Structures are given as C-alpha cells and as structure tokens.
Symmetry: C2
Subunit: 206 residues, 2 copies
C-alpha cells in the first residue's frame, strides 16, 4: 500500500550523474520529490526497485528507471517542453554520439580524479588529460551558444555538472579558453542550472 505514487528521484547531492538528472528536471519545470541518498547507506525502498542500488533512480507510479541516460531520455520524451533533443534522426544521433563522447572523454576522467580508489599516477594524469582536453575543445564554444548547438540540450546537461566541478577536480582553465569560460558564466547563471544545484554542490564553489 506504500508503493511509490508521485514522481521522485533518488539522488546523491554530491554526485555529477545525479546532478545531470536534477538539471533535466529543472529544465522541464516538473514537480518532483528529490530524495537525498548516502551512497554508503542505500535506503530500503531504493534497493527493492534497483538491484544495483545506483543513483540517480527515478520513480513514479509503476515506474523505476536508473542509469542517467535512460532517465534523461525518459524525461525528454515524457515532458516535451521545452525540447532538450533535436527531433530528426541525424541530428538526434549526433547529440547522442556527443553525449557518449562526453562520457568517455570527460566524465570518465573526472570519475577517475574523484574516486579514492585511484592511484596517485591515475588521478594526476587524468586531471592533466581533462584540463588539456577542455582547453582543446574551447574554440568550439565561439561557434554555438551552447555545446555544438545554439540550443539547450541533454548534451549540456551532461557537460555542465563536470564544468561546475573543475575547482573540486583541481583544474583551472587557461586564458586561451575564454570561449569555454564564457559558456560556463552564461550557463551557471541560467535559472534552471541554479535550481539544479544541491547545497553540497553550491558549496563546491565560492
């Protein structure tokens, strides 16, 4: 009788994967009960719906979804307004490809830097590799208002939680990265990004 019946999200307030989803929810303006989870003490209602006990986990009546991209895609399709994906197959495939490249080229490296199981070498090299990669891609931010598009999209939702975390990743971008820095300044100021932040995430910057 106590089964889930309202939209809610099990979210680790410190975790960039959870941030992705909180950001997509904030862009959609939908009503959602955020449920903070400690990643070392999973709640019981989460375990009985996600046998991997990962977050973010999105639940609603007769619904349990996890893995951030599954969730984000569910959200884009369930709540079309406003659109965070292009509609036609070519553009849509290019946005999904770019989300996969962000995951492998950037998110993986951030995860290596943050994970206490990483060796010294691994963390340092990843941290350096991530800094050089973002520096490398920076000129592309002079070409579109968002990342590889003039439109807010799930691409941005994947990238922004990492960029928000550069200080906690021990990374600073050089002056030549102005375009990427300008993107960050614009994007962090948007109301939906400001709404996506947990308190612990706020405390990660000034």
């Amino acid at each position: 009788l106590g089964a889930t019946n309202r939209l809610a999200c099990y979210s680790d307030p410190a975790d960039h994967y959870s941030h992705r989803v909180r950001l997509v929810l904030a862009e959609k303006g939908v009503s959602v009960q955020l449920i903070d989870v400690d990643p070392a003490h999973l709640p019981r209602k989460l375990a009985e719906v996600n046998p991997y006990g990962s977050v973010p986990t999105l639940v609603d009546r007769d619904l349990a979804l996890y893995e951030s991209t599954v969730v984000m895609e569910y959200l884009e399709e369930r709540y079309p307004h406003p659109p965070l994906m292009p509609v036609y197959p070519v553009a849509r495939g290019n946005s999904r490809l770019l989300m996969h490249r962000i995951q492998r080229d950037w998110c993986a490296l951030a995860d290596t830097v943050l994970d206490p199981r990483s060796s010294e070498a691994a963390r340092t090299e990843a941290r350096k590799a991530l800094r050089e990669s973002l520096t490398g891609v920076s000129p592309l931010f002079s070409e579109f208002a968002c990342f590889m598009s003039d439109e807010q999209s799930l691409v941005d939702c994947c990238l922004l939680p990492i960029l928000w975390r550069l200080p906690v990743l021990g990374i600073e971008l050089p002056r030549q990265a102005k375009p990427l820095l300008d993107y960050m300044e614009r994007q962090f100021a948007r109301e939906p990004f400001q709404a996506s932040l947990s308190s612990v995430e706020r405390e990660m910057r000034k």
Copy 2:
C-alpha cells in the same frame, strides 16, 4: 548505400548487422580486423571502433547510438515501443542486458583475461540466463510481443553460447523455444557473418 564497418566475429557488430537486417536496408558491409584499422574508418571515428555507420555527412558509432539511429531513420518495422514509459523500460532492459550478460560474455572472450575470471563469468552467465527462462513463456519476444532492439542485444549473445562454453539445462524450454524460432527468422539469418555461422 549506407556503409557499416563491422567486425564479423564481434557480438557488438552483430547487434547492428541484425538491426540492419530487421529494417531490410541495403548496406555496404566492410569487414574490419581489430588488429588493422582501415584509414577511412580512422578518418571518421577517432576511437577506431566498430560497429561504425557511415552515410554522406553521417558517422555514428557506439552500438546503442547506432541502433537508435537505425530505429528512428528507418521506422518500419518498429523495434521500440512508441510511448515514453514502455520505451524507458526497453532502454533499461538493454542496459541490464549490457551489464549483467554482455559484460560477462566479454570477459569470457577477451584473450587478455585470466583463466579464473573466465571461469566465474561463464558460470554467472549460465545461471542468470537459466533463471530468466520462465519469462520467455509470457511473451513472444524478450519481455514484449514485438521484435525489439532488446532482442537485438540479446540474440548475438544467445547465438554465442557454444563458443562461450554454455549449455542451457533442459528446464530452460521457453528460452530454447525463443531461440529456435528467433534463429530461423529471415532477418536473423541475414545478419550472420561466415564466422558466426562457424560457431555452431
């Protein structure tokens, strides 16, 4: 023609050959040796991965990106449910097939792996498949009554059981029944490489 860079032995490439077969689209298949990466593939895919789909101005890779592209590009016949909830459940089940079954299949087949990891992966895979067999009685396809990208992830692993060193127990009848009809389907037969044939 659309072109597809495909490793004829690789289950991930098999997924995309199978989707292409389901959609009946005319495709130039270019076989790739993982040891020797074609220049024209390097030009469009900086990771040198397969399967890779190329059209004019289009280069897609990662098997799920490619499969979803093919579902949206060539809508007939549909390989995904139309509505957001059932589609989310279909994507979730593809994720679970990936982490529970494909990852185990990958460790078995990787020549880099130690013998102990290969042994446990075989056993884990054998048991999970045997456990879900009852589900195959409830639906014509895997967790649905319509051919789907879910089956497309699953079938290349099922095909590969003998090379993985797994036989399903006689009690797994609904799963075997699913295989018996699924393997005989014209698109599935169209999907097989000469090397995949040689695995049974």
